[PDB]
Amino acid sequence: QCQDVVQDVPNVDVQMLELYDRMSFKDIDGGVWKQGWNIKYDPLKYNAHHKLKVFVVPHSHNDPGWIQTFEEYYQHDTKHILSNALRHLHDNPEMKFIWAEISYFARFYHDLGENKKLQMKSIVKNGQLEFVTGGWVMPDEANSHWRNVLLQLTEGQTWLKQFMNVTPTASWAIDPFGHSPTMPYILQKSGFKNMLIQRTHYSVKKELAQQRQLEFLWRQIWDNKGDTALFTHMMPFYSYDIPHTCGPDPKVCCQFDFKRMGSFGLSCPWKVPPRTISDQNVAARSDLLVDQWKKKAELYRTNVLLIPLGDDFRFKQNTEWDVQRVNYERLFEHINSQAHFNVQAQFGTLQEYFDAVHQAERAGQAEFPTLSGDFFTYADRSDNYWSGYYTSRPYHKRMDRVLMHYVRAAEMLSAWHSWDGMARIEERLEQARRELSLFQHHDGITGTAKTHVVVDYEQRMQEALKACQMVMQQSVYRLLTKPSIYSPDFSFSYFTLDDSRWPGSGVEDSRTTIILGEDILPSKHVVMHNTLPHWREQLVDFYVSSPFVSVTDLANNPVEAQVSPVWSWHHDTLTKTIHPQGSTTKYRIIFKARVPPMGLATYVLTISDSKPEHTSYASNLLLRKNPTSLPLGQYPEDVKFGDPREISLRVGNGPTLAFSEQGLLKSIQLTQDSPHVPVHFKFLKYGVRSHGDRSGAYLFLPNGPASPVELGQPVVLVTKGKLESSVSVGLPSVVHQTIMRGGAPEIRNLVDIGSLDNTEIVMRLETHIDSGDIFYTDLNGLQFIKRRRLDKLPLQANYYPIPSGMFIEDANTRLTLLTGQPLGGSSLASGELEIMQDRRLASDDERGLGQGVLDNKPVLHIYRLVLEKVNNCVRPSKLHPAGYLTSAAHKASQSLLDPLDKFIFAENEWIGAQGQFGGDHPSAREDLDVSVMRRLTKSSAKTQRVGYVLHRTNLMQCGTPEEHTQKLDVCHLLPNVARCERTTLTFLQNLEHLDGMVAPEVCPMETAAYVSSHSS
């Protein structure tokens, strides 16, 4: 039934880890094709009965923000490109154009008059204007979470289906900085049949070109049977621009970019300008161009050749449309009429190219190789590896993950009901999805935009968060209020969200204190939401104005709680120390919330005049020389002081953690009986080269291995409680915190790199795990891929994206670090893991940004650290390219990315309040998630429709006996189901009408989408 994703090593022609191990990577001068070789072809290959079919595909790369904001580019460039494309395509029926970025197309098309909308639909319908991919953006593939790649894809394709009546099945990704197999995974489950990529390491292009393996069936690394495969075309040369798309010699190809003759302020760096095609030169020019084409064709297996014709923000001026079109028309007329070339050349679209390739394949002209793996880390030349952007602008990388979860929660919470249009739910959700989708752009989450553009993205995401909160709190008020009492004002704020980790302590004082007092308000309701489809317990904390607070559930059952002080860290410019201060006006209360699957649970906080029975108080110990007092208002336990010393802590029956006198982990003991396993946290710094190429937002070019941060004698704060303990230390640039709640610790770093120029701060873990040169990192939060550190590559090439986690292991032991934000990282030596925290760079790195990275701001990075025994786990064989998390590590990742949401009732009395929502929801097996729940219909639809994306991961089997769990049938989550359909992941096509209206669960590592229809 399900394929085994662990025990069967797929047989593929190209496996990228294996290729990397055998490949040389030497950077030799290949001639005019600087990174290749002098291509030779047999003139007799093509003849009257076997012609080269050439598709020249005009395109325009439109960054939705980069050096200018989205709106700046729309006004200065893109609106003119699309307006002129409409006119020129309309007037020139054989001309063609492809378009990828639906954010801009939707921005344009809603400003069009109906006349022009009709003209636009007609050039789309007749095939002249073709959408490729059709996502909101062309997303980053390194840092983006798969859920947000799907979100943006769905945003763009839903728009296209509604307004243009088309759904692309060919993808175009010419600019992400390296490529991930998460894309063919999502695309193939979204109806796609073909995809194109460009930015892969120059050594890989050379190696695959030599074997004519640039077109391949790209399957997932665990996929033995190949049902995930998607036909992929990799472009062979250094750029998607015209000099690097006609053939191997850019000095020749630049002469066929007719925008470079001078009046457009562009030129050919190879010093030979384009010449206008005329009758007198067209034979000569045609000979030059066809020779480039036939050389490019030698790198591919069919007689169908793709020639992209475009560059950034091209096809803007009317004169530009004319100069490209007319000159190419003159070339085509001559070439196609001269039999000796045995070429038929024409403007085409991407789908036309792929259709002809597969016609050639079906006619037995070619068979394509199979490939698995990824295309990280990219280098475009020499040792210039693009691993910098795995970390650049980490504040916004973390914000991406926060907004990711708020969008899911807002869509899910509001999906349970139909809402009147006056509630503006659909409007607020559309804004939130679109701002998050825009940020998936390969200059958004990547941290490669200009400072003012990063500010625009942040402002947009802030508005999106506000939109999510609004939707979420209205939905909680409706879900938990007795129906005949529910009396909404859709503008009102019934609850506010409390988020302990965003923007996070010492990032902003954006947390509300619940103010209670005998003379004002005795108690407060709080509500937790659990977006995950299983019952979940999680400690939650709130700020309260008294330490004397007790917690009850909504059967008035006491709930055990712990109160701790509110500590904030300060750089004391007087004492020249980083040290904590305790609030004397507010306190933290912590308790375990238990919440139904996809549900809500209400608790009550009540003040009392003295210590409540079921509330305990943490002790606090400040370790530093020369201490001074730390009063804590009414907090009942006095702070203790001591000189720095090693300390050990244990919460519950969980691990025992030992810390150095500088407050950093040194060992973990899993059980009373077990060994203290060395696990040492260390902070180090990388610098920048004084000679040669400089690191910048894209590139990581360290001046050698990292050097330890000089820590001096830092102040360490130990808080010990029954429910939660922690060790926090004020290091230079980092307030580092280890938090213990009874299982794997949580690490929080408040990272403020300040004015440390040309510095990259890394967090490293040092262990005795005999990992050798192997480690594992995830791709887009979806899968873990085996990495091998290669000493034939420089340090920065051994850096990979860490979008959600990484691990190392040996036969017996594994250490897994889960992240709440994408960052760059590696294992640079056996037993080590490391992950970059922030980077501040004074210089530009020659990739077009025209600035360094000097706009850092404090960011709270969050992690879970899971040390496990794995000798009993059933793991893949040594040759398998994948790895898989354990249950504990997967749950720890979920605790970071989709924590409980916390709501505080905003007024004094909630009348009609209810205790729980969702208690009858099925509690699904732990490896299954409802990644998306989205109502797809507005309230006036007679047939309501709700879409669900179901993802099952694959967890390692390590001998924990399985317990029965309930089957989750998403189609019966809402009443009056009238139909259940399996759909593509965008919900845009029905694939199966399901028996009994039951949505089956999915196999490990698969993702499916279902839509339930309900009579209303």
Ligand SMILES: OC[C@@H]1[C@@H](O)[C@H](O)[C@@H](O)c2[nH]cc[n+]21
């Ligand atoms: O070098 C990479 C940068 C990218 O950041 C932009 O997305 C891309 O469109 C572009 N054009 C020129 C230079 N660049």
Ligand SMILES: [Zn+2]
């Ligand atoms: Zn771009």
